[PDB]
Amino acid sequence: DPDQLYTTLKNLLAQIKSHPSAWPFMEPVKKSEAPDYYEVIRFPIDLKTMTERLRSRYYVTRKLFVADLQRVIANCREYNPPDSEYCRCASALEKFFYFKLKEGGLID
Ligand SMILES: CN1C[C@H](Nc2nc3cc[nH]c3c(=O)n2C)C[C@H](c2ccc3c(c2)OCCO3)C1
């Protein structure tokens, strides 16, 4: 059901982008913020790029969307010190989006 999938993912992404802990993840990391980021992190991802992917019908499966969303968090934990504001935000956003993924029937 492509339309159900699209609208469900759209509605989910809108909620994730509204959460207060989303702020580090809304747009791509700039080289001025982290100069080696694009050498260290080889599949960079952020919520603006996820919005572009959604709208261009990249997310033809639920799993492709979930992979990208989970990678926002994984990249943060790989790049940054484990005790850091960015990792705190990542953990808070993750907690929220797992509540929302469960609410939406997108994971068990
Ligand atoms: C686009 N860019 C992404 C940055 N994202 C980011 N930068 C770094 C640097 C080292 N590591 C990481 C990392 O993992 N991420 C995700 C966050 C940065 C930002 C800075 C200050 C803010 C803010 C956003 O929004 C509200 C107010 O102040 C914006």
From Swiss-Prot:
Tissue distribution: Expressed in all tissues tested.
Complex formation: Homooligomer; may form a tetramer of homodimers. Interacts with EP300, CREBBP and ADA2. Component of the TFTC-HAT complex, at least composed of TAF5L, TAF6L, TAF3, TADA3L, SUPT3H/SPT3, TAF2/TAFII150, TAF4/TAFII135, TAF5/TAFII100, KAT2A/GCN5L2, TAF10 and TRRAP. Component of the STAGA transcription coactivator-HAT complex, at least composed of SUPT3H, KAT2A, SUPT7L, TAF5L, TAF6L, TADA3L, TAD1L, TAF10, TAF12, TRRAP and TAF9. The STAGA core complex is associated with a subcomplex required for histone deubiquitination composed of ATXN7L3, ENY2 and USP22. (Microbial infection) Interacts with and acetylates HIV-1 Tat.
Lineage: superkingdom: Eukaryota
Range of the intact protein held here: 729 to 836 of 837
Function of the molecule: Protein lysine acyltransferase that can act as a acetyltransferase, glutaryltransferase, succinyltransferase or malonyltransferase, depending on the context. Acts as a histone lysine succinyltransferase: catalyzes succinylation of histone H3 on 'Lys-79' (H3K79succ), with a maximum frequency around the transcription start sites of genes. Succinylation of histones gives a specific tag for epigenetic transcription activation. Association with the 2-oxoglutarate dehydrogenase complex, which provides succinyl-CoA, is required for histone succinylation. (Microbial infection) In case of HIV-1 infection, it is recruited by the viral protein Tat. Regulates Tat's transactivating activity and may help inducing chromatin remodeling of proviral genes.
Domain-related comment: Loop3 is required for substrate specificity and adopts different structural conformations in succinyl-CoA-bound and acetyl-CoA-bound forms.
Locations listed in the record: Nucleus; Chromosome; Cytoplasm, Cytoskeleton, Microtubule organizing center, Centrosome
Crosslink feature (Glycyl lysine isopeptide (Lys-Gly) (interchain with G-Cter in SUMO2)) location: K31, K63
Name of the protein in question: Histone acetyltransferase KAT2A
Residues that bear Phosphothreonine: T7
Sequence similarity: Belongs to the acetyltransferase family. GCN5 subfamily.
Domain annotation Bromo: ranges: 1-104
